[model samples]
Target: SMEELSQALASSFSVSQDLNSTAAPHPRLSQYKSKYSSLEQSERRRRLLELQKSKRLDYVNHARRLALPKHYANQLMLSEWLIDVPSDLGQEWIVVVCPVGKRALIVASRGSTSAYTKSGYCVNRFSSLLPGGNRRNSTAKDYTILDCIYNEVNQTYYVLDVMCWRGHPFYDCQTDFRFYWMHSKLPEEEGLGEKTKLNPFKFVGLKNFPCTPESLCDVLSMDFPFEVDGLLFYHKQTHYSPGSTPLVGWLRPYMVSDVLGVAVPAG
Candidate 1:
């Protein structure tokens, strides 16, 4: 993306230079000078900044769109209609959620730790694909899966809670569906354990989720074996709201295979 930007800037500069050089000299170059030059320059600068801002917003918006809720809805529909259950009950499944400007964190059954804990699954393994060496330690202990609840307010999807079987009967799933079902049926007690589910905002306990840009690149570079799902949510930092532009609309339903070349059918 930066390469493309540099090429465009170079082309524009060359054209501007040629335009100035080809202009015929005025009889009174100084006297004929119009304030329009400064105005034009200012306008050009404004346009340049606007163009740059648009590009940046597009990038961030594109990323957010890739992670929107409608995509997840489509995946659920596909899973219900098209996915076939394997005969072997032991066949492990991997769930990954890749949000732009964030790390590709995998969620698996607690018992499948060995599969994802191996060196190949290490977040740092794909550092070459990231913008910077922003890789960090990702262990089976660092993550878990839960039935996530999303609330759409003002064009952004806020993660409201992470649900599990033990918290509320309405939210409970069968023992087999519990996050740690493979290892232990009992709900493990932890900081947010008693609450049955966790609030994503409270889980991070920071001004915002801290997965950096480099981390997002690392995840984008990796090749994985199972299906990945995403949800789009506008970050408060962006200038455009959800209804104002089709930024999020354009990115939802993009295939990981299309984006990363490792194809797993959407489920």
Candidate 2:
């Protein structure tokens, strides 16, 4: 309406100056005033920060105390031992040791086809209708050595091997060959009545022992023959195949033991 509206709008501005300008207070003066004005608040905040720092330090120290280191001797020994170890049934092997307690546990892995092979290593599924056809095709057998101690005084190592019932999840039995059908002669035993002449040790069951790396640490720390000063777990991933690197994991002394089994000390 107004001459096609102006293309730009007018701007307004204002300026102020303190001509007197005696002297501004020091920049630090404001900070000083604020600090003094909030003394109670400042003190509370400082105390909280200190408490947090103390807690963080405590956690760090605890973790450091429980840290486990690698055992070079074990690594070298296994590398040489597995070079020609025979597996009549296409088995795999893993060795674990706790350096602190000098405890060692061994596990064997079973191949799916090994059971059906003529090698006579097939697993008894108890029944074929169940999953995995009585043999766990992809799972592994778990084992644990308990209550191990390195006697500096005697210069000897002592340990126990714990075994369990066929289907138990954890290592919960003794290593008496009698409990296993293949190794035992107790045909009159309740479960033994229907079992074939084959021994339990000879026949792989529905589940292998359920020993985990973590559980191994727990058994070492708590019930180990001697006081546990530390612990470490080691496994060789490439023992049977090429281009494989050994795997090593550490554990803390405070970790819990989840397996229940009779302890058989190694003399």
TM-score top scorer: 2
- Segments in model 2 whose C-alpha atoms lie over 4 Å from true places: 1-150, 157-222, 236-246, 255-267
lDDT digits (tens) for residues 149-202 of candidate 2: 333433223322212112222121212221232223222233422233221222
Candidate 1 regions with alpha-carbon error over 4 angstroms:
1-237, 240-244, 249-254, 259-267
Candidate 2: lDDT of 128? Answer: 18
Model 2 superposed RMSD (Cα): 28.3
TM-score of 2: 0.20
Q: Give the per-residue lDDT digits (tens) of candidate 1, residues 5-69.
A: 76454334442232212122211232333221121222332343354354433223222232122
Q: What TM-score does candidate 1 reach?
A: 0.20
